[PDB]
């Protein structure tokens with residue numbers, strides 16, 4: 168080994184090295200950190216083409232940055248345009264259908280170019296979240312090696328740094344109280360107070376319920392049952408997320 | 418409008434727009450849709466969307482379709498801003514970039530011999546740090562929602578009273594210091610509490626949002642863990658746990 172890194176990450180990296188060997192690899196490339204990492208590893212070790220599908224959901228600035236970032240790392244890259252907007256397909260089934268249309272090109276591109284595999288930049292952390300398009304890519308036989316090797320996001324950052332891939336800066340363009348929300352707050356307090364016998368002092372932003380409380384009550388909510396009930400019911404009041412302050416007051 | 422406060426703001430807008438030719442800096446978002454619709458119902462109005470390459474086609478199309486839906490006259494003007502190197506600070510890149518939009522809006526106002534340019538900045542916005550607000554002011558672009566002290570709730574309420582739909586979430590939908598802070602928080606909790614499975618630390622406004630699976634959740638439940646995790650994730654300078662596992 169030419170880099171010294173933790174054995175866990177080194178095994179994952181080595182698995183990637185062997186997997187790409189002697190393959191012609193189409194990489195589904197979005198320009199982000201995750202798909203940049205695997206594009207660079209593939210291109211350093213195999214005949215590789217990073218393919219960006221421009222379906223109208225990425226601005227020119229984002230597309231240009233992805234192209235310049237591939238050139239910077241000597242990753243062969245092409246941007247292929249589809250007019251997906253004019254071919255519409257449902258309620259968020261757009262996610263699956265939008266991603267499926269991206270998956271369907273690339274599979275066309277892989278067959279036209281007689282390449283061997285398509286890989287993407289989906290990581291292990293991603294498959295625990297609600298991302299419908301992961302199904303859509305699997306249905307086109309697009310492999311997620313970072314997910315197969317159980318890459319966390321931390322593993323992506325560390326491996327990127329070892330391979331001297333810069334984390335891209337933010338476009339952005341920082342810091343971000345009325346009362347309906349006083350009503351939601353109080354009813355959330357009243358609900359938990361009445362149901363968990365939370366006599367002691369205890370719900371605070373952007374429709375997110377921030378709960379504060381003391382240690383003695385804290386042992387009561389630890390059972391998942393409570394949390395499952397507390398998360399659904401404080402969302403019935405319309406809070407989109409329920410969250411608990413780990414700063415237990417005196 | 419069941420509220421006199423909101424009724425007064427609305428009436429102030431109607432009175433100000435009467436008999437004026439109004440250019441609206443229109444992005445398709447809730448705020449500039451609200452003032453475009455009020456201008457458009459009460460005055461000769463043109464909603465202008467500047468396509469500078471930082472908005473996707475989908476966003477442009479949705480703004481155009483949203484204008485058509487509410488009978489707001491609308492035009493998308495494309496500029497090739499990306500080809501111009503004029504700024505190099507993240508606050509001067511914003512400022513100079515927004516200046517380029519403002520300058521295009523001012524060109525259109527003079528060419529069409531219109532009277533005023535208004536935008537959708539609200540009162541809440543001016544307390545946050547957004548560089549381009551300076552740039553629009555320097556082109557004499559007015560912020561009526563800010564001048565009348567619209568909060569975010571006032572916009573939502575007035576929109577509902579005027580039957581403007583609040584747009585749904587976009588399909589399938591961050592500095593280096595905060596990526597770094599988050600990453601160190603994950604590393605800390607994973608290594609210390611044997612969180613083999615999924616663990617992530619989301620950051621909003623320097624607040625640590627911890628995410629994890631049900632099976633791992635049993636590990637952190639004891640007060641001891643939370644006391645240590647709350648102090649140490651503040652050592653990084655951020656602490657709260659998302660109850661939706």
Ligand SMILES: Nc1ncnc2c1ncn2[C@@H]1O[C@H](COP(=O)(O)OP(=O)(O)NP(=O)(O)O)[C@@H](O)[C@H]1O
Nearest residue numbers: 195196197199200201202203218219220287288289
């Ligand atoms: N327009 C696109 N063209 C090509 N590949 C794409 C495109 N959009 C997404 N992908 C791929 O699909 C993967 C998963 O999509 P997504 O759920 O949006 O993850 P992601 O957060 O964008 N990953 P990344 O941006 O590379 O760090 C990405 O890592 C890319 O490999």
Ligand SMILES: Nc1ncnc2c1ncn2[C@@H]1O[C@H](COP(=O)(O)OP(=O)(O)NP(=O)(O)O)[C@@H](O)[C@H]1O
Nearest residue numbers: 442443444446448449465466467468518536537538
């Ligand atoms: N591309 C654009 N073309 C025309 N006007 C624009 C454009 N982008 C922004 N504006 C105007 O500038 C105002 C303030 O900019 P900004 O705060 O970035 O937009 P925004 O849509 O209000 N985002 P947000 O306040 O977070 O909802 C908008 O309300 C619009 O009136």
